[PDB]
């Protein structure tokens, strides 16, 4: 779980040191940025099922070949797993805005994903079309505030650079 606190303790433990002034100075920047990304987290916590119906078919309108026979998404029990997977990925971005780091996206969503989708014949570009549609559908004074949409759209393209 990579956060701000679990990387200044894990660096102080790796040299056998007490927490010094540079370790206490990094928790202060976790306090200052906490008003921004917790505004973005409660925006995502109520509005999560709207933005995954909006971003799920943005994959399917770009890629209509998934509903071909022989392909990834034929029947209705496979389309709903694709809308399950975007809600899995949007929940972990809500977890990353709480802990203040890319911890819960890493071990729960990113690690091992490039061998899951490669073996189970899922195209990784159809995942990234759902995340990148959500990146520019955000309106920076309307939905959240200005720098609170900075850290919402900073964890979104960390997921985009990881998936490809």
């Amino acid at each position: 779980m990579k956060s701000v606190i679990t990387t200044v303790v894990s660096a102080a433990d790796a040299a056998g040191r007490f927490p010094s002034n540079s370790d206490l100075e990094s928790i202060q920047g976790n306090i200052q940025r906490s008003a921004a990304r917790l505004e973005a987290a409660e925006k995502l916590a109520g509005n999560h099922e709207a933005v995954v119906k909006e971003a799920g078919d943005a994959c399917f309108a770009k890629y209509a070949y998934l509903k071909n026979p022989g392909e990834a998404g034929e029947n209705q029990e496979k389309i709903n797993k694709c809308y399950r997977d975007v809600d899995h990925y949007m929940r972990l971005v809500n977890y990353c805005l709480v802990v203040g780091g890319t911890g819960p996206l890493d071990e729960w969503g990113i690690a091992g994903a490039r061998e899951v989708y490669r073996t189970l014949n899922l195209p990784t570009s159809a995942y990234v079309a759902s995340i990148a549609y959500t990146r520019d559908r955000l309106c920076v004074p309307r939905d959240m505030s200005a720098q609170a949409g900075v850290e919402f759209s900073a964890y979104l393209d960390y997921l985009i650079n990881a998936l490809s």
């Binding site: 779980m1 956060s3 606190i5 679990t6 303790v9 894990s10 102080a12 433990d13 056998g16 040191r17 007490f18 927490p19 010094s20 370790d23 206490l24 928790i27 202060q28 976790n30 306090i31 906490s34 917790l38 987290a41 409660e42 995502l44 916590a45 109520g46 999560h48 929940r91 809500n94 977890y95 709480v98 802990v99 203040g100 911890g103 819960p104 729960w108």
Partner: protein, 177 residues
Amino acid sequence: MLDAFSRVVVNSDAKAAYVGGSDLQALKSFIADGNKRLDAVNSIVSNASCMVSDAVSGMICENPGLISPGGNCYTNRRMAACLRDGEIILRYVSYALLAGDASVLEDRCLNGLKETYIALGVPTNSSIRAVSIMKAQAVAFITNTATERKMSFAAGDCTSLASEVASYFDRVGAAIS
């Protein structure tokens, strides 16, 4: 390892729920009192060399058999490896005070510590009354009631941080019991 915010995520991951609005009311009061937490671990780390020498040499005041021949704090290799071990325990307690959660103490320090001390021949009852001297030292340094050194703080009340670091010290003595 976990911290205080990774602890509330893995509770919310157990029900596959989003960290909503009612449980953000308590997280905003954690970060509002985050300046007292950094002001509290700074009163332990500043006093940390005299804390493990008031404690190990106060353990000897209640047990002269450690400094008898054959004893555990007898020779110079053995007193040096006990003053080493007393400040490892103070290091991982101050990590969990800083992280807000005792997960780094329970698996990197306290797991397997009891049967480590059986095998080397360490008296585990003398370690419990050594880490309980450091428990009383830490809660005198948080609440600014040590008699020989006073530090300069702002006005207020840090009693909840005193009984959070007291519960990290009776979590040590439950593991070597």
